[PDB]
Structure 1
Amino acid sequence: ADLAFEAKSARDYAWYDVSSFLTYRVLRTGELEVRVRFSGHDEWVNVKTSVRERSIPVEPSECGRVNVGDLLLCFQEREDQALYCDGHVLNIKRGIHDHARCNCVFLVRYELDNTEESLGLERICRRPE
């Protein structure tokens, strides 16, 4: 099936699903940027760093494929806002569950500010592969 992407916002440094792409531009420094139209407004993002293939949700029967050190798109809830930003799995507490719901617990370190949090499979999306 078709490719779908997400783009990193230069405002909050989170990732959003790209609905479509509009145009591109080169910087005199040489970087390639792309104008991205989001889902749900309009940004320029570094192709090389800030554009990638959309993260994939993980099904309870899959949780074995997520490991310590992995990079993950994590749902990050705070006061008002909530963002989907990059983090790395530091430690995993495996639970007992079936195919219905994953109660394994993932300690991840957010890339931006280096903070830590315990997330359930329901709040993480893996990178392809």
Structure 2
Amino acid sequence: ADLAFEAKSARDYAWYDVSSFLTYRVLRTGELEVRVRFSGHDEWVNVKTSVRERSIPVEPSECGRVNVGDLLLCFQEREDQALYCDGHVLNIKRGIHDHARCNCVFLVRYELDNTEESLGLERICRRPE
């Protein structure tokens, strides 16, 4: 299977699945940027910093491969809005569960503002590798 990607947006700092790439441009400065179309509107995003390989769901049977200090894309639901953004695992309370669903609790620290939330596996994706 081929590489899929996600891009970070300058509007909200959240990551969105990239559908396709349209063109590119070089800045006076030398930074390279890329015009990205999102799946589901259109943006210039820095290649080095704001585009990476798509995060990957964790299945309950493999919840053990998530550790502290791991970087994860987290579904951060609030008021109304819901953003997928980066946080790091600070701590894990492992639960008693089978392959069907994971009741482990992952305390994450969101990178942007250092706020803290407790998430289920269902609201986190790991990074490749």
Give 1:80-95 correspondences, 5 Å limit. Answer: 80-95=80-95
* 1:106 Cα deviation from its structure 2 partner: 0.1
Residue 31 of structure 1 deviates from its aligned partner by: 0.2
Structure 2, unpaired ranges of 5+:
none
Root-mean-square deviation over aligned CA pairs: 0.4
Q: CA deviation at 1:80?
A: 1.4
Distance 1:15 1:62 in 2: 24
State the TM-score, normalizing by the size of structure 2. Answer: 0.99
SS of the residue 1:16 aligns to: strand
Structure 1 residue runs of 4+, over 2 Å off?
none
Matched-pair identity in %: 100
Aligned to 2:110: 110
Q: Following the alignment from structure 1 to structure 2, what is the Cα–Cα distance between the partners of residues 63 and 81?
A: 27
Q: Distance between the aligned counterparts of 1:69 and 1:50, measured in 2?
A: 21
- Cα displacement string for residues 13-34 of structure 1 (whole angstroms, at most 9, x for unaligned residues): 0000000000000011110000
1:118 CA drift (Å): 0.1
Separation in structure 2 between the aligned mates of residue 28 and residue 96 of structure 1, nearest angstrom: 56
Match of 1:99 in 2: 99
- Structure 1 Cα separation of the partners of residues 74 and 45 of structure 2: 20
Matched residues, number: 129
